[PDB]
């Protein structure tokens, strides 16, 4: 279960380093699967984006993304958010946001 | 210039992060300079190249190090400090700071405050590590880290750091390593869900020769008393400045219209002789009573009509009413009857009553398992005060905010403290690690030891 409190800042990349043992390359590759995951089009579409990112083995990531899409996104979003401009900008798009309102609800709750 | 985009940051264990041991090297076992590992989990020296942290960093590709007095997490084998203000959580448990306004927001606790682990908790209410025989210090600590004016007191750095103490003086880290204890254990985002009294209980036993050691548990009595006083001595520096924070927040005055007896073996004349040759007068010997030893009686060893229960109740009015002003008491002096009497001149703000359920028989020390039927919602001690100030007091109704009792035979016995939170009204009773729920109606129910009451 990809609780909301469950990921952190750092779990995207600590995750995706499980395949990847180079810590610079391990983390361009979770900046560019966390690029292709925000700004997405298509479940296929972005299943095989990343599938380009991190190669056609490793089906535990597409896995993830399926469970989790904007889950992921939001929660990397708002626990990376380096500032309040950013963690209030994050909270407020995942106020309108009806399940990313109910993952906030539950984070704090 | 390579902070910012640090990828060896997203390795940091949070699980493993104690930082309340003391703050030493793992190898070079120096106070100096010290960093701690942030994936190692231990501490070493140093902040560079050929020292310690920077060897164990290379050998244990632990990348990633924060200095526990710099409060700066850098990447020790590139020696490049690093920036990410997602990181803030472990300096806040590795130095808890309360705000100016956060310091006075503890009576609107609300929300649980859930650690970094699996557990959500209050701030407060957590438990202290009985380390070996710990129970009653750990007891005590977590019982006036209740009292908000000395966890207010303790929570702000400033009102104790510029403390003009002697260079030379051990008796300073009580002052210092109690402030660290209450800071902790009020910390709202803590990384565990309980802190280690090991730092502060090391320092109390050595700041005490020998004395209330974490080996052999003490008295529970003893062992408050003993805090109380070196802290109303350490809060004070380079003077004799009596206004110390303890000293006003749980330290009253009592005026004992004390007396004598004549003697036992005289005739009327002799004793009359001294009853007006003022060696039998009435004195009055105002003293500041820090703690009020509300004596329970001794049960009567006997069954009654009454009572299913064989357990002597006693009422807590009856029990307090004998340091009012008419209830005289004897004391067994040497070649002496000395029968006085007390009254109390003037309530602190948090009186703080200790009764005494252990006394020492003819061949043995007994434990007195009389209970205390004290009411925990509100009482007032104007019917037991001093005649003269009676209307000077405008405040009298208090209510007791923690309670500790000492459960068990008097050789082998635990310490378990009931206090009454709050923020939310749940009186909690708090084992040495367990935090449990209390019913109010059971609180009254436990023999207590020490209580401390708020005035309101």
Same mark, same amino acid.
């Not at chain 2, 557990?119 to 209740?146: E, F, M």
């Not at chain 2, 966890?151 to 390593?177: A, C, H, S, T, W």
């Not at chain 2, 008491?329 to 000395?338: D, G, P």
């Given at each position: 279960d990809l609780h909301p409190r469950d990921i952190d800042a750092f779990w995207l990349q600590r995750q995706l380093s499980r395949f990847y043992d180079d810590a610079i390359v391990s983390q361009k590759k979770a900046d560019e699967v966390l690029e292709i995951l925000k700004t997405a089009s298509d479940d296929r579409e972005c299943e095989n984006q990343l599938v380009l990112l991190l190669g056609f083995n490793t089906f535990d990531f597409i896995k993830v993304l399926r469970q989790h899409r904007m889950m992921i996104l939001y929660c990397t979003l708002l626990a990376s958010a380096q500032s309040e401009a950013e963690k209030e900008r994050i909270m407020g798009k995942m106020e309108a946001d009806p399940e990313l309102s109910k993952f906030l609800y539950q984070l704090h709750e | 210039r390579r902070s910012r985009h640090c990828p060896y940051l997203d390795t940091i264990n949070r699980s493993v992060l104690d930082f309340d041991f003391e703050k030493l090297c793992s190898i070079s076992l120096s106070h100096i300079n010290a960093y701690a590992c942030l994936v190692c989990g231990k501490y070493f020296q140093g902040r560079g190249l050929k020292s310690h942290a920077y060897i164990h960093s290379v050998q244990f590709s632990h990348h990633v190090f924060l200095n526990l007095h710099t409060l700066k997490f850098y990447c020790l084998p590139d020696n490049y400090e690093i920036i990410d203000s997602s990181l803030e959580d472990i300096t806040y448990v590795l130095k808890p700071t309360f705000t100016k306004q956060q310091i006075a927001n503890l009576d609107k606790q609300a929300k649980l405050s859930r650690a970094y682990?699996?557990?959500?908790?209050?701030?407060?209410?957590?438990?202290?590590?009985?380390?070996?025989?710990?129970?009653?210090?750990? @007891?005590?600590?977590?019982?006036?880290?209740?009292?908000?004016?000395?966890?207010?007191?303790?929570?702000?750095?400033?009102? +104790?750091?510029? =403390?003009?103490?002697?260079?030379?003086?051990?008796?300073?880290?009580?002052?210092?390593?109690?402030?660290?204890?209450?800071?902790?254990?009020?910390?709202?985002?803590?990384?565990?869900?309980?802190?280690?009294?090991?730092?502060?209980?090391?320092?109390?036993?050595?700041?005490?020769?020998?004395?209330?050691? =974490?080996?052999?548990?003490?008295?529970?009595?003893?062992?408050?008393?003993?805090?109380? &006083?070196?802290?109303?001595?350490?809060?004070?520096?380079?003077?004799?400045?009596?206004?110390?924070?303890?000293?006003?927040?749980?330290?009253?005055?009592?005026?004992?219209?004390?007396?004598?007896?004549?003697?036992?073996?005289?005739?009327?004349?002799?004793?009359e002789q001294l009853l007006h040759n003022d060696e039998?007068?009435?004195?009055?010997?105002?003293?500041?009573?820090?703690?009020?030893?509300?004596?329970?009686?001794? @049960?009567?060893?006997?069954?009654?009509?009454?009572?299913?229960?064989? /357990?002597?109740?006693?009422?807590?009015?009856? /029990?307090?009413?004998?340091?009012?002003?008419?209830?005289?008491?004897?004391?067994?002096?040497?070649?002496?009857?000395?029968?006085?009497?007390?009254?109390?001149?003037?309530?602190?703000? +948090?009186? /703080?009553?200790? =009764?005494?359920?252990?006394?020492?028989?003819?061949?043995?020390?007994?434990?007195?398992?009389? /209970?205390?039927?004290?009411?925990?919602?509100?009482?007032?001690?104007?019917?037991?005060?001093?005649?003269?100030?009676?209307?000077?007091?405008?405040?009298?109704? +208090?209510?007791?905010?923690? &309670?500790?009792?000492?459960?068990?035979?008097?050789?082998?016995?635990?310490?378990?403290?009931?206090?009454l939170h709050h923020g939310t009204g749940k009186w909690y009773e708090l084992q040495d690690l367990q935090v449990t729920d209390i019913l109010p109606q059971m609180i009254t129910l436990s023999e207590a030891y020490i209580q401390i009451w708020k005035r309101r």
């Open positions: - | 682990d699996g557990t959500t908790y209050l701030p407060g209410i957590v438990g202290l590590n009985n380390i070996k025989a710990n129970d009653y210090a750990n @007891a005590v600590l977590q019982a006036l880290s209740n009292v908000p004016p000395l966890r207010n007191y303790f929570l702000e750095e400033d009102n +104790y750091k510029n =403390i003009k103490r002697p260079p030379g003086d051990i008796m300073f880290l009580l002052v210092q390593r109690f402030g660290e204890l209450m800071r902790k254990l009020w910390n709202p985002r803590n990384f565990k869900a309980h802190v280690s009294p090991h730092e502060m209980l090391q320092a109390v036993v050595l700041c005490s020769k020998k004395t209330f050691q =974490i080996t052999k548990q003490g008295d529970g009595v003893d062992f408050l008393s003993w805090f109380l &006083n070196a802290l109303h001595s350490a809060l004070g520096g380079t003077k004799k400045k009596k206004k110390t924070i303890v000293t006003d927040v749980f330290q009253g005055s009592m005026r004992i219209f004390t007396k004598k007896l004549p003697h036992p073996d005289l005739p009327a004349e002799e004793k039998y007068q009435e004195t009055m010997v105002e003293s500041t009573f820090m703690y009020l030893t509300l004596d329970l009686p001794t @049960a009567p060893l006997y069954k009654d009509e009454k009572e299913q229960l064989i /357990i002597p109740q006693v009422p807590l009015f009856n /029990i307090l009413a004998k340091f009012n002003g008419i209830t005289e008491k004897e004391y067994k002096t040497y070649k002496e009857n000395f029968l006085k009497r007390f009254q109390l001149t003037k309530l602190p703000p +948090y009186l /703080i009553f200790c =009764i005494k359920r252990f006394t020492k028989n003819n061949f043995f020390v007994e434990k007195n398992p009389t /209970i205390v039927n004290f009411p925990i919602t509100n009482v007032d001690l104007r019917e037991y005060l001093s005649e003269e100030v009676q209307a000077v007091h405008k405040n009298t109704t +208090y209510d007791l905010i923690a &309670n500790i009792v000492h459960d068990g035979k008097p050789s082998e016995g635990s310490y378990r403290i009931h206090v």
